[PDB]
């Protein structure tokens, strides 16, 4: 359960898991996450910006 450095994960096929719902951005108590998104070239819902300020994060 230890909480360390952040990472973004993939499905077994290699496709990203993140779908730009921005729930993490909404809930973050330090406002450390910044997200931008748009439809990908194949129509998928994906991010174009996913930034975490680690000097703002309270982990």
């Amino acid at each position: 359960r230890f909480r360390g450095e952040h990472a973004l994960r993939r499905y077994p096929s290699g496709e990203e898991r993140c779908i730009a719902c921005k729930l993490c951005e909404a809930v973050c108590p330090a406002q450390a996450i910044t997200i931008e998104a748009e439809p990908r070239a194949d129509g998928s819902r994906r991010t174009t910006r996913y930034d975490i300020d680690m000097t703002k994060c309270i982990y």
Binding site: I19, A20, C21, K22, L23, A26, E36, A37, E38, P39, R45
Partner: protein, 230 residues
């Protein structure tokens, strides 16, 4: 003059004849849950989310389509009204897809908010859900029909406000679907309003897709300059 007296939770209200139960309730600041009723569109009565209990009446009435009668005592927060709301919300959510994180309506959804405010907090639906195929009605309005709750708001707007009779329903019961039955773009100078009137993510803006969430946006009120209507 011709005003009659009705009671909303024991409070006397004087209203004009032909006033519906929903309007009498909002005369005192109580907003009844709704999905198919729009105040600028014809009354439909199909969703059944507006059902309320009238005192000394065994059957609940549809507040959106029932005219108030003299001496009536609406009970907007009784056990029967709450149970009717919970049952209707359960039926609405039974076949709804788990699409909220990928849905553009998320965060400003009437289905979500009214489930939070008037429905239950869990499911007892143990079957598989339905899935309908998508429709193409032009480059402006994105269509994801599986999310449709069959409100029929878009059909009424198209017929009455836009004057275009291209929208309707095909099939019956569970299989009933909203569309054009053929490949035909619903193109109108007012077509983009069906996105606003649709309470769910079934009809959404295609240029806006996936770009923002409602809690993020800052709202500025201004005037349109694209014509002289203002």
């Amino acid at each position: 003059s011709n005003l009659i007296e009705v009671f909303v939770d024991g409070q006397s209200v004087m209203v004009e004849p032909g006033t519906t139960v929903l309007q009498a309730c909002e005369k005192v600041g109580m907003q009844i849950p709704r999905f198919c009723y729009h105040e600028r569109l014809s009354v439909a009565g199909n969703c059944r989310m507006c059902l309320v209990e009238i005192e000394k009446a065994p059957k609940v009435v549809a507040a959106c389509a029932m005219p108030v009668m003299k001496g009536w005592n609406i009970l907007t927060n009784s056990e029967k009204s709450k149970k009717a709301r919970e049952g209707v919300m359960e039926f609405l959510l039974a076949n709804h897809p788990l699409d909220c994180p990928i849905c553009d309506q998320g965060g400003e959804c009437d289905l979500q908010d009214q489930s939070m405010m008037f429905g239950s907090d869990r499911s007892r639906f143990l079957e598989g859900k339905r899935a309908v195929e998508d429709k193409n009605i032009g480059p402006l309005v994105k269509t994801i029909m599986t999310r449709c709750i069959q409100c029929t708001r878009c059909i009424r707007f198209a017929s009455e406000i836009a004057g275009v009779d291209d929208l309707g329903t095909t099939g019956r019961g569970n299989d009933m679907q909203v569309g054009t039955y053929i490949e035909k773009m619903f193109m109108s100078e007012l077509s983009g309003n069906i996105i606003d009137i649709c309470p769910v993510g079934a009809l959404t803006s295609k240029p806006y897709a996936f770009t923002a969430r409602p809690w993020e946006t800052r709202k500025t009120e201004s005037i349109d300059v694209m014509d002289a209507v203002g």
